[PDB]
Amino acid sequence: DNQFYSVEVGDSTFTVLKRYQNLKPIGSGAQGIVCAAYDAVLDRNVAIKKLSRPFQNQTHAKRAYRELVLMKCVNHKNIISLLNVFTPQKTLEEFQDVYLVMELMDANLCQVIQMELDHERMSYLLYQMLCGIKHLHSAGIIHRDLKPSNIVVKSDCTLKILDFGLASFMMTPYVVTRYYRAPEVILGMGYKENVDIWSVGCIMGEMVRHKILFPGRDYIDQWNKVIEQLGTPCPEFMKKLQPTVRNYVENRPKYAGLTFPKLFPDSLFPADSEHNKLKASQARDLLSKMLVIDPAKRISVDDALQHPYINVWYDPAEVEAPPPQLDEREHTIEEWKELIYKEVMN
């Protein structure tokens, strides 16, 4: 009669409501482990993510808490929406794990990126990204760590952003992925909404080139890859760095940076018909307005949406949805436990 049951998926134990059957592993989420399942109440397939003792330290706690209050606020077809949240534990004192449940998708954007994609599909995924990002901004959320591994797609080309970005020790095995973070993030710069444009450009460029644009062990290597390719930023951009970070950067070797046709030659694009030739040059134009070091001359999110490569998909019902207490804290682990628990028990 217990309303829960336990199954072994991979290494992790999943204790879930009886409505969820046939759990099968599917991926890794750092914040937790994930599985596919059939939801018999809803008669549809779902994905279930287990957050193990999210209160065990401030990084897991802040993230877990932050994302519960937002998934309980945002509402947009391209942004994760939760179907259920639950814990199999009965009291706060026993409270351990949190399970999040959402619509089951077909692929992670890392998988899509390795595929050869026509312009119809590339422009559509990117357009969805910008729509989701635009919603986040309308809700007062600026992401600042959008990356492909936290983006999922359905076979029909529909897309969802699964996380809400940055707010820091992590005593774990797994590394954080930093290749898509804007310069202002790399350099401790302060930022505005089009910080997220940079990351879109990084994703789009990788779609074209099929390799990470700015790899590196550290922000050191990564900045090297940025200037080697795009050219040293404008002195005007220097003047906005902090003095110490400004000294480091100004003392880096100078680079002219390659043109975008060299950074993304026609070889990479479908360019057999006239239609495709024009699409490639539009694609390269957009890339050139997104992969821009100085945020001041980097294209907006609303301006990107209305770029010719992108605005073929326009619909005032998807770029124009209504946006619905600011939590911003730092607590002990028992404090975090109760705060998360209350939210789990809305």
Ligand SMILES: Cc1nc2c(cnn2-c2csc(C(=O)NC3COC3)c2)cc1Nc1c(F)cccc1Cl
């Ligand atoms: C890591 C992760 N992957 C997810 C989803 C949804 N789809 N996928 C997904 C990625 S590959 C794949 C697949 O191969 N599907 C085929 C079709 O049959 C098997 C499905 C969600 C998360 N994370 C997550 C969550 F599960 C619940 C609540 C909050 C969050 Cl953030």
